[PDB]
Amino acid sequence: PSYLKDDDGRSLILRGFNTASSAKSAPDGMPQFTEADLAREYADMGTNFVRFLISWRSVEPAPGVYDQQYLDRVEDRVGWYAERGYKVMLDMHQDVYSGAITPAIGNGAPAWATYMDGLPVEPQPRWELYYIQPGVMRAFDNFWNTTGKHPELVEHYAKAWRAVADRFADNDAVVAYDLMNEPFGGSLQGPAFEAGPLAAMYQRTTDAIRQVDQDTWVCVAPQAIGVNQGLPSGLTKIDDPRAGQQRIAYCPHLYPLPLHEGLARTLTDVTIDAWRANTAHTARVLGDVPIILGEFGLDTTLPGARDYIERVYGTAREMGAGVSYWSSDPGPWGPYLPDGTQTLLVDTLNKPYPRAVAGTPTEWSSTSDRLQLTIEPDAAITAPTEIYLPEAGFPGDVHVEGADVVGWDRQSRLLTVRTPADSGNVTVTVTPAA
């Protein structure tokens, strides 16, 4: 597998949340999430990544007019993450195109960019079914210019992304731009969509971003419907005009149909197998690119939920993938219920992991009181390998075999170690001091 790198050349293992669905409907575009909430997340789970939801409607409230005050607010939040050593992926998020689909249900595009052409959007028994209503299908068909009536819309979208990239190009905490949440093709579905207008929008948007930001990873998603459930994607390779190596990453989601017991469990387990095979294939098509599992999640109160979550994280580990869990929002899917009580997720996610590796991690494992990591060396890297150790299992000092301890910060929970680069692959084992 391939990895995103920090400025020191270290390979990043990214673990965090989507923050947050509450931003979708907020008039000011910000999630209901405070700096104290982040402090709690970090204290409880030691996360190092966030998929932070932004919106086209907040970036470009009128055609060609970008809201710099909104971008100030995003920058403020990014600062909270920066101060705690997080890396940030900005997600241009939408569901069902826009809030403007009913006079709320959807989110994303500004009202001026929403053209339903008078076609109906009647109430449906679940929100996903709004996607196939005449007015919503038309809004998407207009956006992709399948109708031929709105070539300007993708151009606006690309330049809205350029405005965001212009603000964040020099932001050391931002590592990735997730160009579009869960692309939906309207009347176009499958390869005709993914290899057609979807790939074309990604290329235009990448090109626009690269006018102002040469180094941030541009992350592209397949269409969500079908591919979320383990079907193959027809997405094609996107060119990165940056000087040097390509910085495109693949950001699919995973949402098995049965969602964890009985035949449902078997169906979900083979879905993971199919999803892995397909994800690996498309990551190759895109140029042997890094993978970020941009979303997966479920009601943690469902029997078998822990086994599912642990299998997904194990699969992500084997694939060298980052993970942003859906989501930090309060409720049974998230790490905390509305009153602040921890769900199953906290103890499940709160495990040792390597955050930034001085070399390519070839394999690793962890339990509550042990981490083992094998590193393919890179002599050019002078920064230490950085590892998270939970206080639960590591209440005092560390015992490290296979590396020299550089520092052990018992407050931030960051262990830094140094390994030789001229002795082949190195295995580092970390356990609690006696």
Ligand X SMILES: OC[C@H]1CNC[C@@H](O)[C@@H]1O[C@@H]1O[C@H](CO)[C@@H](O)[C@H](O)[C@H]1O
Choice from 174, 188, 219, 286 touching Na ion (CB under 5 A): 174
**Of the candidates 326, 353, 364, 388, which one interacts with ligand X according to CB under 6 A?**
326
By CB under 5 A, is residue 114 in contact with Na ion?
yes
Select 37 or 295, whichever has its Cβ closest to ligand X: 295
Using the rule CB under 6 A, which residue among 95, 178, 194, 213 binds ligand X?
A: 95
DSSP 345: H
What is the smallest separation between the CB atom of 292 and Na ion, expressed in angstroms? 15
Q: Read out DSSP for 249-288?
A: EE--B---TT---HHHHHHHHHHHHHHHHHHHHHHHHTTS
Taking the least distance from each CB to ligand X, the nearer of 308 and 408 is 308
Q: Which is nearer to ligand X, 184 or 202 (CB)?
A: 184
Q: Given strand 217-220, what is the order of strands in its sheet?
A: 248-250, 217-220, 174-178, 87-92, 49-54, 15-19, 322-325, 292-293
- The DSSP result for 363-426, as a single string, is EEEEETTEEEEEEE--TT--SPEEEE--TTT-SS-EEEESSEEEEEETTTTEEEEE--SSSSSE
Applying CB under 6 A, among 184, 295, 305, 416 the residue interacting with ligand X is 295
Which residues in the 103-132 window bind ligand X by CB under 6 A? Answer: 107, 127
Q: Which of 5, 10, 15, 24 binds ligand X (CB under 6 A)?
A: 24
Rank residues 194 and 295 by Cβ distance to ligand X and give the closer one. Answer: 295
Q: Nearest Cα to 289, choosing from 324, 345, 245?
A: 245
Q: How far is the CB of 326 from ligand X (least distance, A)?
A: 5
CB of 213 to ligand X, least distance (A): 25
* Residue (107 or 206) nearer to ligand X, CB: 107
Alpha-helical segments (H) within 152-304: 152-168, 191-193, 199-209, 262-285
Contact residues toward ligand X (CB under 6 A) are 21, 24, 95, 107, 127, 182, 295, 326
Contact residues toward Na ion (CB under 5 A) are 111, 114, 174
